[PDB]
Design an enzyme around this catalytic site. Structure first.
Site, PDB file in Angstrom:
ATOM      1  N   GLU A 141      26.400  50.470  44.854  1.00  0.00           N
ATOM      2  CA  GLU A 141      27.231  49.443  44.191  1.00  0.00           C
ATOM      3  C   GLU A 141      28.695  49.650  44.579  1.00  0.00           C
ATOM      4  O   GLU A 141      29.357  48.649  44.811  1.00  0.00           O
ATOM      5  CB  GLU A 141      27.072  49.522  42.674  1.00  0.00           C
ATOM      6  CG  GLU A 141      25.698  49.042  42.180  1.00  0.00           C
ATOM      7  CD  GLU A 141      25.400  47.558  42.329  1.00  0.00           C
ATOM      8  OE1 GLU A 141      26.279  46.831  42.830  1.00  0.00           O
ATOM      9  OE2 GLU A 141      24.244  47.144  42.084  1.00  0.00           O
ATOM     10  N   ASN A 176      31.648  37.473  42.961  1.00  0.00           N
ATOM     11  CA  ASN A 176      30.335  36.815  43.050  1.00  0.00           C
ATOM     12  C   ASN A 176      30.568  35.348  43.472  1.00  0.00           C
ATOM     13  O   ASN A 176      31.638  34.757  43.200  1.00  0.00           O
ATOM     14  CB  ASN A 176      29.607  37.011  41.723  1.00  0.00           C
ATOM     15  CG  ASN A 176      29.420  38.470  41.339  1.00  0.00           C
ATOM     16  OD1 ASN A 176      29.624  38.869  40.183  1.00  0.00           O
ATOM     17  ND2 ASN A 176      29.070  39.308  42.308  1.00  0.00           N
ATOM     18  N   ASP A 234      29.420  32.795  42.056  1.00  0.00           N
ATOM     19  CA  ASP A 234      29.515  31.935  40.847  1.00  0.00           C
ATOM     20  C   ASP A 234      30.958  32.002  40.305  1.00  0.00           C
ATOM     21  O   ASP A 234      31.253  31.282  39.314  1.00  0.00           O
ATOM     22  CB  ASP A 234      28.422  32.291  39.834  1.00  0.00           C
ATOM     23  CG  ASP A 234      28.599  33.652  39.174  1.00  0.00           C
ATOM     24  OD1 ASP A 234      29.548  34.392  39.576  1.00  0.00           O
ATOM     25  OD2 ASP A 234      27.842  33.938  38.243  1.00  0.00           O
ATOM     26  N   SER A 237      32.270  34.826  39.033  1.00  0.00           N
ATOM     27  CA  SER A 237      32.353  36.055  38.224  1.00  0.00           C
ATOM     28  C   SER A 237      32.783  37.170  39.180  1.00  0.00           C
ATOM     29  O   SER A 237      32.744  36.966  40.404  1.00  0.00           O
ATOM     30  CB  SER A 237      31.061  36.342  37.516  1.00  0.00           C
ATOM     31  OG  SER A 237      30.046  36.590  38.464  1.00  0.00           O
ATOM     32  N   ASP A 251      32.428  41.625  39.757  1.00  0.00           N
ATOM     33  CA  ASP A 251      31.754  42.897  39.421  1.00  0.00           C
ATOM     34  C   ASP A 251      32.819  44.010  39.477  1.00  0.00           C
ATOM     35  O   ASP A 251      33.615  44.073  40.464  1.00  0.00           O
ATOM     36  CB  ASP A 251      30.672  43.178  40.459  1.00  0.00           C
ATOM     37  CG  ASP A 251      29.411  42.341  40.368  1.00  0.00           C
ATOM     38  OD1 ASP A 251      29.254  41.562  39.432  1.00  0.00           O
ATOM     39  OD2 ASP A 251      28.546  42.560  41.232  1.00  0.00           O
ATOM     40  N   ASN A 309      29.232  42.987  35.727  1.00  0.00           N
ATOM     41  CA  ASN A 309      29.562  41.566  35.991  1.00  0.00           C
ATOM     42  C   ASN A 309      30.272  40.950  34.780  1.00  0.00           C
ATOM     43  O   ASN A 309      29.782  41.125  33.658  1.00  0.00           O
ATOM     44  CB  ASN A 309      28.256  40.844  36.325  1.00  0.00           C
ATOM     45  CG  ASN A 309      28.432  39.473  36.920  1.00  0.00           C
ATOM     46  OD1 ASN A 309      29.510  38.932  36.849  1.00  0.00           O
ATOM     47  ND2 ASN A 309      27.368  38.897  37.484  1.00  0.00           N
TER      48      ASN A 309
END
Ligand code: NA
EC number: 3.2.1.17
Length: 129
Positions: free
Chosen positions: A35, A46, A48, A50, A52, A59
């Site tokens: 990650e 992201n 969308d 959003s 992380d 998220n």
């Protein structure tokens, strides 16, 4: 902060992640490696819109507030910036809520794709725990 592998394994163990919801410590270290490469300051946008945040790439769609993710929730009741601290407390506490949400560590797509079913014990090999 960029953690060492065994340094992060020790911090996760002290914060009670080892075998949390039945996931051995190597599962958490493996997830953190893919990650964030063990970098608390890791951020990634992201599709969308959003973002992380932190060692476990938590998220803003559900788990933290960053003030720029429309229609999102803050289920860990924290600012997403708390997830970038050198102190992993907020990341770990929020990770415990995520992994309790019903799909276990499948919540972390990099865990499912890169850790699940693999020899995750290798990630804590040699560590003084
Ligand atoms: Na949010």
């Amino acid at each position: 902060k960029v953690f060492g592998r065994c340094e992060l394994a020790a911090a996760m163990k002290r914060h009670g992640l080892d075998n949390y919801r039945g996931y051995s410590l190597g599962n958490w270290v493996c997830a953190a490696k893919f990650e964030s490469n063990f970098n608390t300051q890791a951020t990634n946008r992201n599709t969308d819109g959003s973002t992380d945040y932190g060692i476990l790439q938590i998220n803003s769609r559900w788990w933290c507030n960053d003030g720029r993710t429309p229609g999102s929730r803050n289920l860990c009741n924290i600012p997403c910036s708390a997830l970038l601290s050198s102190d992993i407390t907020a990341s770990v506490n929020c990770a415990k809520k995520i992994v309790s949400d019903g799909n276990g560590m499948n919540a972390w797509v990099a865990w499912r794709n890169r850790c699940k079913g693999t020899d995750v014990q290798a990630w804590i090999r040699g560590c003084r725990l």
